[PDB]
C-alpha cells in the first residue's frame, strides 16, 4: 500500500496473507468470507505470462496477522488448502477480466478477536454503496512504493471513480466486472494498492447496518499511485452468481 498508514490491531480481521511454502514469501492478499473459504484474485494463482500456476500444496494461508514477517504465535492461524477454484472465464490474456478465485481450507479456522469474516454484498448493498465519490478501504502487506516493504499491515481509504474517468486513464479495455478507485491529480490526497496487495479486499462499511462488505478485490494498476492512474478492482457483486455456485457445489 502506497501513502497509507499502519492498521490498528483487529482493524481488518478478514485479512488473509497468501504465503508461498518454498521459498517462504508473501504472494498476495486475500480475505476470509467464512470459516472454510478464502477469496482472492485469480492472477495470484494463475498468470501464465509470469509462469505462475500454483497448486494447493505450493501455498499456505495465514489469518489473523498484523506483522508482515513475524510468526505471530497464539494470534495468527496457518491453514492448508483443500482446493483452489478459479473463475472459468478469468481473462489472463488481455485485461484480467473476472479476476477472482476461491480457496477452500482443509479445516475450519477458529474465530477470535483477530480472525473474523467479512460480508459479501447482495444487489441492494452494491447499488447503495458502489457510487463515484464513495470511499472504500484497501489493506495489505504489499510494497510501500512502485520503485520498501512494511513492518505491519497497511491501510488506505480511496474514493470510487466515475466509469468514464477509469476508462480514460488507460489503454486497457475496462469491463463491467471491474471498478476503479483513487484520487484525481487535483484532489491533493494520494494512495493506492501496490505489488503484494493484489488479491486483498476493498471494503466499505454500510451506514444502513454498520457491517463491513467486501465490494472489490485488488486486481491491477499501471504501476502504483501514479498521478492520473487508478487502481482496478474486481467487482465482487457482479461475480456473486459464480461465488455462490462454487460454495453451493463443493
Amino acid at each position: 500500500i502506497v501513502e497509507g498508514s499502519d492498521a490498528e490491531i483487529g482493524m481488518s480481521p478478514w485479512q488473509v496473507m497468501l504465503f508461498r511454502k518454498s521459498p517462504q514469501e508473501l504472494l498476495c492478499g486475500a480475505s476470509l468470507i467464512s470459516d472454510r473459504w478464502v477469496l482472492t484474485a485469480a492472477h495470484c494463482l494463475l498468470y501464465p505470462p509470469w509462469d505462475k500456476n500454483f497448486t494447493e500444496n505450493d501455498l499456505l494461508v495465514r489469518i489473523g496477522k498484523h506483522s508482515r514477517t513475524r510468526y505471530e504465535r497464539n494470534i495468527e492461524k496457518i491453514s492448508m488448502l483443500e482446493k483452489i477454484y478459479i473463475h472459468p472465464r478469468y481473462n489472463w490474456r488481455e485485461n484480467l477480466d473476472r479476476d477472482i478465485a476461491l480457496m477452500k481450507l482443509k479445516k475450519p479456522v477458529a474465530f477470535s478477536d483477530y480472525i473474523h469474516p467479512v460480508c459479501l454484498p447482495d444487489r441492494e448493498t452494491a447499488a447503495s454503496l458502489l457510487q463515484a465519490g464513495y470511499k472504500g478501504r484497501v489493506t495489505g502487506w504489499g510494497n510501500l512504493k512502485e520503485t520498501g516493504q512494511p513492518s505491519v499491515l497497511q491501510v488506505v481509504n480511496l474514493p470510487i471513480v466515475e466509469r468514464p474517468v477509469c476508462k480514460d486513464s488507460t489503454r486497457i479495455r475496462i469491463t463491467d466486472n471491474m471498478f476503479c478507485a483513487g484520487y484525481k491529480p487535483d484532489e491533493g490526497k494520494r494512495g493506492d494498492a501496490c505489488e503484494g496487495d493484489s488479491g486483498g479486499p476493498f471494503v466499505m462499511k454500510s451506514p444502513f447496518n454498520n457491517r463491513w462488505y467486501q465490494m472489490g478485490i485488488v486486481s491491477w494498476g499501471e504501476g502504483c499511485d501514479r498521478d492520473g492512474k487508478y487502481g482496478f478492482y474486481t467487482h465482487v457483486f457482479r461475480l456473486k452468481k459464480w461465488i455462490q455456485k462454487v460454495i453451493d457445489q463443493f
Binding site: 511454502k21 517462504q24 514469501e25 508473501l26 499456505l60 514477517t69 513475524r70 510468526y71 496457518i78 492448508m80
Partner: peptide, 10 residues
C-alpha cells in the same frame, strides 16, 4: 526475511 513458521504447517 520471513520468520520460520512451525514445521507442522510445511
Amino acid at each position: 526475511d520471513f520468520e520460520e513458521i512451525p514445521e507442522e504447517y510445511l
